[PDB]
């Protein structure tokens, strides 16, 4: 029944399709803001591009995190998902996987456009697409405790950022280190191995600590 | 007079109905003549060579991607003072067309700047201003969609159309000053040799006609979307057959 | 009167042949998407009204069954 | 034994002691109705019995085992309808009912949605429906479930009299085969006092 | 009665003081993100610091903008504030001025610290403090229409950013150009004059386009 | 003339025609009650009457002028209490009442909060109060206002019978001089039929 | 036994009440001994000169800045298994003390780094790790404040304390590796000349005692917040006089 | 046994005095602030309970007035 929840969340996401583009439009806003401040200089932008790309990715996923749980509290669907005959770790895993398929895949297909806007080569696009693929699920799994904790609040938009971003600091460092090594044309296999290790660890541990937070917030 | 009768939604439906075909075929004729007299039967620039043909696919796609927005203000203004709902539907009618024209302007500008600059996207003032215009179109569309009630969504869209229009000279001149400060640009948008000019003007007028056709047809789409229960649609659909 | 003397040379505009046809195709596609989307939206709204009003007729049939 | 037994439940919502020392056991095929006075706090009671809210003191018991252990068997035998219907407004009514178990085939679908009063409104989107008809999808979930335990926070809200009659008929039919329907309703209800049992959370 | 609304909004904000610091902690986390991405090199950080400062300031103010109107929707206060015998332009002006005293003055007192973490000198701190003083009111007046429309929405966290940030692009360009002209020591009076000009224009035009917008959002 | 007159009010919330063609004029000193049948849609009528909601077609008039022009004189003579009380939960009750005009000095303070039933709970924060006692602050605003026109979306929601009696006595005292109180309530109220008037938005 | 009676709220209140004074005066004596044997009656580092005394004001303020958080983990763990509300209250008791200790560590680290680096903030691994720890403390405190119900706020704080402790070694080693590349660092925090050692250990133990005193005080404050109505407070305040 | 021979030279810690005394003052102040906010909060809670219980006594006085 774990797949029925995932397929239904995909159906509700795909019904009004428009709203899933707003994370990538915000991502493109944040890509736009830095060269306006810095300048049009292509060497400085070529060096600074990992910082822009990953701060934009963190903020775009973070603002997209509201759709992960804020809908089902008001509709009452979150309660009924909690009393499904399934352990709530699996329900949380299904919601985070659907959220990655609705918020991380838009960034992964938008990846050629941002790779052409800043100026990275085809190796840079390959490493950034692979690192986005290994990192945006980790954004989902670190954001899920914060959303589960701050779904009861009316004003939970700044607080969710404050909780999530220090958790995403290690992924930030390894992702930007991977693409700093990629810009100098080095093999980035080890950095992707650490990225996959963090992905596996957070994917294992985050449903079990998001389920408890979600039980706390509803009651 | 009949201008007051231009507010009844079924009457606007048949007026748009008989202005789609003739304006559409006129658009096809004018734009076909413009491109056939521009991408051939025409010289080339001395410095840029045979890459000047892009100045067709960009410049009606640039100017009208502002012009639609300017016309949008008019509709939004009619939405705010006289409380005309159909002008607020016209805003939502023209928002995707303006967004697509802006995307075309960006894509043709990048494809033009590659054989000169060497890369697809140098942060030029023109392309950056077009990108901000695209962002404003996305904002208007997302407001029109994220709301449930269509009427109040149109009123909301009209409000941000007017906000964007008031802030639009400031953004354009601030971006032009941004390129003034850092590093200059070449003569790209409207630095045109004579006798390559009338195909461009013909393509501009053809893009105007195509935008008017697409506007006048999505207006019918939105009018059918709201009046889905009133009996005039029933009489129309029983007339269908 | 064509500037390009050969019709085969027309498709290759002086070395800068990829960019012109790239933007030509990338302008033709979104206009076709807009026209197809708008025509299909009009057809879909009309067919949705058709289904809604057939269901309204079935409501009328149910009312006639309740009356009889 | 009766399966659902409540033992010394104490709850303080925002440091207001809503009820104290309350302990009631329910045998099979009994039809308890909560008859308290305050608007909120009986809904809180229903959330404590369903396992949404942990009791601050005492415990709820299902077949002799506490609720923190027997979740995977308790949630196989319960149907909960709150004040919010628990359905998605974005999907259609048939897909919303198909999310919950079975539906699908005509043996368990398209008459369950009919006996709630939603015949002819099966494929319409939920957001284009009246609020009572939005609640009637979750109310239509009753005719397809196998859950022995039903718990209802205001089921007869914006429901016409024929609807309440049909719900009470199906609900007494459930009461016949050992099924318990714990519910809270505002309206005075048209069932004989011999069958009912009232649990009052006094003060 | 324009001042009673302003004083009451200050009392509600100051009664639970803690929340006011959450914008500046989000600001400080966003300052923390880019040294970790770019690197600890002080010349590059000194060059990029205007961009970090204004991306952080726009995002901190933007997530702070939810408290400007979202509280009064659920409490029912906003309706009664329209039904005071006062033109709702003045009510909107009082709320935005109070929000600047709640969201912008924390940044202006935090200004020495973020000047210390990015290596700017005393002139750099002076120009950035003056530029924040002339810019964050403008941030409030441009954010007020977006909050006014996206107060009725359940999902108004990404949409608000999409509306607000292209409006605030000119503030970005003139502010970061002012700090670029401050780093290489020049008189920056003209840039501050343009900042004040935009401040005066948006202060004039934003209540009149926020009052009607807030009427649309609620009816 | 009567001051408040509604002329051909038609309302379509989410493309559902709640009412159309309703037009009623109200002379001074009457206590019309909006009967209604649906739960929402009479609240929409009250919000249309206060000027929160623009009529989709037709118009509301205050003393012969449309509401889009005479806002600064209309809002000086009206008191609106919706389903939400309109007070801040963060502030204290006395300061919340002092936000609204007068209050302050003992000629207009500390008996207005007392006659609503909130004697002795003046300085407690609102968020540590029961919901009926939260609504009684806005209800206490009645004894201090100078407004001729009062419009009430469910004034009697979770107030005890003595509170309703005091509210109706103050409301009849207001009705004695020139002034209209428009209200909507579920409960059958205890005033003679001869004084009241019923304006029902029929379906 | 009496460990079960330690969860009774009045009994825990008088246990904290008689534990505050003696532990506080012991803390004052030990920390005074520590600073007064470290700031004088002690040598100074040969290279860094007399700027090494700051290593007291940093290092009990650094280690215990983690220690409190680690102790917070223990309390948060007691929150989730045995469902003891007072451990979740102890999390909120210890979070501001850890935040203030972290702020002290950051400020003294910057004051130590000025006479060497020349700038108040060179982005060293230690100060960056303490800054991230401070952000974690602010997250815990702001969750404890945002919520209305104190019990549920403490339970939410326990959840995020366990999240932060799970992800904290990852952050520390990622920051350490972040200055494995991107230049290196000197030996500053725990490279100590002997005979300049017992003052630092004495100050560490004194900061432990001060943290325990402030914990034992704010635990009483939060207990008095939560049971503001129950009659044990009534008998205590009628005993006051 | 003091490393600093002069007690006046103790206050000027070998040239590096401003940084040491700056962090000393900026360490002493926050801990003093935390101790003050831990004492004043306890006093404020106890006195707020005192006001609540005086008002509860006036509630009982009102109940006695209603009974009499």
Author numbering:
A (entry chain B), E (entry chain b): 2 to 220
B (entry chain c), G (entry chain C): 3 to 243
C (entry chain d), H (entry chain D): 2 to 69
D (entry chain A), F (entry chain a): 1 to 203
Publication passage describing the model:
Here we report cryo-electron microscopic structures of the heme translocation complex CcmABCD from E. coli, alone and bound to the heme chaperone CcmE. CcmABCD forms a heterooctameric complex centered around the ABC transporter CcmAB that does not by itself transport heme. Our data suggest that the complex flops a heme group from the inner to the outer leaflet at its CcmBC interfaces, driven by ATP hydrolysis at CcmA. A conserved heme-handling motif (WxWD) at the periplasmic side of CcmC rotates the heme by 90° for covalent attachment to the heme chaperone CcmE that we find interacting exclusively with the CcmB subunit.
